[PDB]
Design a protein around this ligand. Structure first.
Ligand SMILES: [Mg+2]
Length: 175
């Protein structure tokens, strides 16, 4: 219904993966959902889906992800599985991101190593539960929560992190 496309765009094309390998596949899913990515090695952000590197075989790993105004959703997070090197993620004004998404991510082993830096800005459906789940990123050096109206017991988050990730810089920007 006037938006089935969301399912089409979030579909996971395991064939494509196995062909051109996870990072490439995940860059197509992302940019086609109005996200951007940045490969280890470059300063340029990939932002135009049609300009994606389609030659230099299998050298581009994904390192930072910017979902602003994006239409990604958890039925598609299988794209995030075989990603070895992701260090940054920014989620901002993404309507369909919420607690379930944050769980799924925070349970991706490959990401639990690689992640250093996360920001959740202005995503209305996320909550305290979703946030706390983020402790499983054992290497997370910094995490910015801003404009998250679904988050209530802030202070209690600050504690959980204080204990389970003692040296995480934890910028807050909450009501
Ligand atoms: Mg966008």
């Amino acid at each position: 219904f006037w938006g089935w496309l969301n399912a089409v765009f979030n579909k996971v094309d395991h064939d494509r993966i196995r062909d051109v390998g996870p990072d490439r596949a995940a860059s197509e899913w992302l940019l086609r959902c109005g996200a951007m990515v940045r490969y280890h090695g470059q300063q340029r952000w990939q932002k135009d889906y049609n300009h994606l590197p389609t030659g230099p075989l299998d050298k581009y790993k994904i390192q930072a992800i910017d979902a602003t105004d994006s239409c990604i959703m958890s039925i598609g997070f299988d794209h995030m599985e075989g990603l070895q090197y992701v260090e940054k993620i920014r989620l901002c004004k993404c309507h369909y991101i919420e607690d379930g998404c944050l769980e799924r991510l925070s349970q991706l082993e490959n990401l639990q190593k690689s992640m250093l830096e996360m920001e959740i800005i202005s995503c209305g459906n996320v909550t305290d539960k979703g946030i706390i789940a983020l402790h499983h990123f054992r290497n997370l050096k910094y995490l910015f929560l801003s404009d998250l109206p679904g988050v209530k017991e802030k202070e209690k988050i600050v504690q959980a992190f204080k204990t389970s990730l003692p040296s995480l810089e934890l910028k807050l920007d909450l009501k």
